[PDB]
Amino acid sequence: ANKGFLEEVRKGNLERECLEEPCSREEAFEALESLSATDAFWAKYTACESARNPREKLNECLEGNCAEGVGMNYRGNVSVTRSGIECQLWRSRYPHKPEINSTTHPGADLRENFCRNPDGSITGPWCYTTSPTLRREECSVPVCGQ
Numbered sequence: 001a002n003k004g005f006l007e008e009v010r011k012g013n014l015e016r017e018c019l020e021e022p023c024s025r026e027e028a029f030e031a032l033e034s035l036s037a038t039d040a041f042w043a044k045y046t047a048c049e050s051a052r053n054p055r056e057k058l059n060e061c062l063e064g065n066c067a068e069g070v071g072m073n074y075r076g077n078v079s080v081t082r083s084g085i086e087c088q089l090w091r092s093r094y095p096h097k098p099e100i101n102s103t104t105h106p107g108a109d110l111r112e113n114f115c116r117n118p119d120g121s122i123t124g125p126w127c128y129t130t131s132p133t134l135r136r137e138e139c140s141v142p143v144c145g146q
C-alpha cells in the first residue's frame, strides 16, 4: 500500500508492501526482481484474497499445498486426476493440444503434469489427461483449513 507521502523513496519490500499491507501489481513488481517472479507472485496473491487474515491463513494459501476457494492458488504435486488418470505434461502436445500453457498463463506454474487451476475452473485444480478420450479432468487436492 502507498499511504501517499515518502514511503515510495524506499526500495521495494514484499513483506512490508504486499504481505503486511495490500499492494498493487506495480508495487509487487517494484518489490521483486523480474517479470517472471511478478507474474507468479501476482497469480498466487490474487488467488488468496479470501484468506488474507490472519497471516497464518494467508501464508498457507500462498504456499499452495492446499486449495483455497476454487484452487487457483494451488501449487502442489498431485499429478493424477479424480478418476485416477495420470496427468499429461503441460508442455506436451499429446494426446491433447493444450489451449492453456506457460504462454497464455504465465505465473500459473504449469510445470510438469501437476494439477493446476489456471482458468478458475469451477470444479477446482485440474490437468489435461493422458487418456486420448478425455481432454481434461479435475483432481483431488486437499482444501485449505479443513
Ligand SMILES: CCCCCCCCCCCCCCC(O)OC[C@@H](O)COP(=O)(O)OC[C@H](N)C(=O)O
Pocket: 003, 005, 006, 007, 008, 009, 010, 016, 017
Ligand atoms: C517525511 C514526512 C512527510 C509527511 C509530512 C506530514 C507531517 C508529519 C507526520 C509524519 C507521519 C507521516 C510519514 C509519511 C512518510 O513520508 O513516510 C516516510 C517513509 O519513508 C516511511 O516508509 P514505509 O515504512 O515504507 O511506509 C509506511 C507504512 N506504515 C509501512 O509500514 O509501509
Ligand SMILES: *[C@@H]1O[C@H](CO)[C@@H](O[C@@H]2O[C@H](CO)[C@@H](O)[C@H](O)[C@H]2NC(C)=O)[C@H](O)[C@H]1NC(C)=O
Pocket: 076, 077, 112
Ligand atoms: C514437488 O515437485 C517439485 C518439482 O518437481 C520438486 O522439486 C524439485 O526437486 C528436484 C529434485 O527431485 C530438484 O532438482 C528441482 O530443482 C525441484 N524443482 C523446483 C526447482 O521446484 C519437489 O521436491 C516436490 N516435493 C514434493 C511435495 O514431493
Ligand SMILES: *[C@@H]1O[C@H](CO)[C@@H](O)[C@H](O)[C@H]1NC(C)=O
Pocket: 090, 091, 098, 099, 100, 101, 102, 103, 104
Ligand atoms: C501455448 O498455446 C499457444 C496457442 O494456443 C501456442 O502458440 C504456444 O506454442 C503454446 N505454448 C505452450 C505454453 O505450450
Ligand SMILES: [Ca+2]
Pocket: 001, 002, 003, 007, 016, 017, 021
Ligand atoms: Ca507502504
Ligand SMILES: [Ca+2]
Pocket: 001, 002, 007, 008, 017, 027
Ligand atoms: Ca508502496
Ligand SMILES: [Ca+2]
Pocket: 008, 011, 012, 013, 017, 027, 030, 031
Ligand atoms: Ca514501492
Ligand SMILES: [Ca+2]
Pocket: 015, 016, 020
Ligand atoms: Ca512482517
Ligand SMILES: [Ca+2]
Pocket: 016, 020, 021
Ligand atoms: Ca505498514
Ligand SMILES: [Ca+2]
Pocket: 008, 026, 027, 030
Ligand atoms: Ca510505487
Ligand SMILES: [Ca+2]
Pocket: 026, 030
Ligand atoms: Ca514503478
Ligand SMILES: [Cl-]
Pocket: 095, 096, 097, 098
Ligand atoms: Cl487436441
Ligand SMILES: [Cl-]
Pocket: 091, 110, 111, 112
Ligand atoms: Cl515443465
Ligand SMILES: [Cl-]
Pocket: 121, 123, 126, 127, 136, 137, 138
Ligand atoms: Cl476440468
